Amino acid sequence: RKKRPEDFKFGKILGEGSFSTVVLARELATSREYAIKILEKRHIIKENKVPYVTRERDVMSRLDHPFFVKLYFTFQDDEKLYFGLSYAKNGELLKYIRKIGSFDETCTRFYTAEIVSALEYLHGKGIIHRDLKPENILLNEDMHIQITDFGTAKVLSSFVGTAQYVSPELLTEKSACKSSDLWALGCIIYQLVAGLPPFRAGNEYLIFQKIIKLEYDFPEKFFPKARDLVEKLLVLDATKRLGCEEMEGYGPLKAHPFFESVTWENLHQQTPPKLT
Ligand SMILES: COCCOc1cc2ncc3c(N)nc(-n4ccnc4)cc3c2cc1OC
Numbered sequence: 659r660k661k662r663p664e665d666f667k668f669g670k671i672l673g674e675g676s677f678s679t680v681v682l683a684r685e686l687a688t689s690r691e692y693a694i695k696i697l698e699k700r701h702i703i704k705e706n707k708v709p710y711v712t713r714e715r716d717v718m719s720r721l722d723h724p725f726f727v728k729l730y731f732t733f734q735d736d737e738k739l740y741f742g743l744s745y746a747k748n749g750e751l752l753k754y755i756r757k758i759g760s761f762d763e764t765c766t767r768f769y770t771a772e773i774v775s776a777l778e779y780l781h782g783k784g785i786i787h788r789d790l791k792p793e794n795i796l797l798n799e800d801m802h803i804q805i806t807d808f809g810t811a812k813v814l815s816s817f818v819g820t821a822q823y824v825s826p827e828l829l830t831e832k833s834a835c836k837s838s839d840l841w842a843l844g845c846i847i848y849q850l851v852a853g854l855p856p857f858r859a860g861n862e863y864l865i866f867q868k869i870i871k872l873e874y875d876f877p878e879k880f881f882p883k884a885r886d887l888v889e890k891l892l893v894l895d896a897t898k899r900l901g902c903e904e905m906e907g908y909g910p911l912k913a914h915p916f917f918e919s920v921t922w923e924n925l926h927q928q929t930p931p932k933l934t
Pocket of ligand 1: 672673680693695727743744745746747748749750796806807808
């Protein structure tokens with residue numbers, strides 16, 4: 659039953675990383691489009707990434723939620739590993755943030771809520787993403803989110819992700835917890851509303867300075883209830899972010915006033931607000 663490269667008509671490159679290329683592919687027998695992640699074995703071995711690639715495949719096998727990529731299949735030839743992933747027709751969330759500048763309140767609320775549910779599911783399984791960002795939050799043809807890129811993930815019984823979204827505890831204890839994803843969630847909300855990430859600067863080092871000093875500002879037009887929520891996520895003490903277990907988990911966070919009108923139980927059956 660293993661699939662093979664010949665079973666597909668490969669098309670355009672969707673994305674490139676240091677250790678992988680994601681290519682759109684149309685399976686011949688079915689007409690189905692998959693986003694196939696291709697990784698060269700030699701380069702993985704050379705750079706000691708075997709544990710990272712193994713962990714990524716293992717974590718993805720365990721994801722069975724409409725808000726996360728799905729691993730349909732894997733195979734390999736002599737030089738390469740192939741992971742068959744769900745194809746997110748409408749691409750990165752980042753693209754929409756730039757096209758429209760910033761989201762109105764209805765949109766921010768709806769998409770934030772979906773990210774929260776996704777995180778609730780993910781953290782429920784003791785998995786931490788460690789690199790959450792609009793680049794990693796994809797939109798499929800229905801405009802529901804699909805979170806991907808699990809090569810940096812950690813399974814709870816070393817790293818640093820993208821500078822703008824790195825939490826203080828990572829720059830301090832070199833540590834990482836569910837809270838780290840929640841910090842990143844705080845930045846993404848800020849970004850949906852403001853149009854830009856909260857911590858900006860000329861280089862990695864300057865960005866890290868602002869992060870540890872909690873140096874950022876809210877624009878005046880920022881939705882008040884959204885601001886309050888952000889202030890309860892962008893908290894230096896990881897032990898005091900809305901959503902973390904020390905703060906008693908996702909119940910209080912979902913009960914936040916910003917999510918007042920949200921029906922949490924069937925988000926992926928709701929039709930997303932039109933993005934304008
Ligand atoms: C605008 O419409 C074009 C569609 O663009 C895309 C569709 C995707 N559809 C699906 C993915 C998927 N399952 N995984 C990853 N990815 C990135 C790291 N590791 C995995 C990436 C994509 C992916 C990336 C894409 O461009 C950035």
